[PDB]
């Protein structure tokens, strides 16, 4: 028996430089995990290596996870840290869109509820 992710979905990363957001081509996975100290972790894993390469401890009202309407060739989402300039960008990698909005809802619900 092992603790399971609260939500997970396939997604790649993108990087912002200056004003330009450019995709990273790797297959990845966004997930939210509650560790046994009750803390909530927003994570990104490289699906090819299996390496967890982002692991952020998030508290209620730190963040919003929002669709980015400025990109028409993908389903791009941003984890925005409301207090400063920190932003993490992701592009959905599920073949269909029919769970995108539910995944977005669940991310916001788990990050912003105590």
């Amino acid at each position: 028996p092992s603790n399971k992710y609260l939500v997970e979905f396939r997604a790649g990363k993108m990087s912002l430089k200056g004003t330009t957001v450019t995709p990273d081509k790797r297959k990845g996975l966004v997930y939210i995990q509650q560790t046994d100290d009750s803390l909530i972790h927003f994570c990104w894993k490289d699906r090819t290596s299996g390496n967890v390469e982002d692991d952020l401890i998030i508290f209620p009202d730190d963040c919003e996870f929002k669709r980015v309407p400025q990109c028409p060739s993908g389903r791009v989402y941003v984890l925005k840290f409301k207090a400063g300039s920190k932003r993490l960008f992701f592009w959905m990698q599920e073949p269909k869109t029919d769970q995108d909005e539910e995944h977005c809802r669940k991310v916001n619900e788990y990050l912003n509820n105590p």
């Binding site: 995709p23 993908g74 959905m92 599920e94």
Partner: peptide, 14 residues
């Protein structure tokens, strides 16, 4: 498995 989408094009964020 079903083919995953191609990466999006770069875009402007300000």
């Amino acid at each position: 498995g079903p083919q995953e989408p191609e990466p999006p094009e770069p875009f402007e964020y300000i």
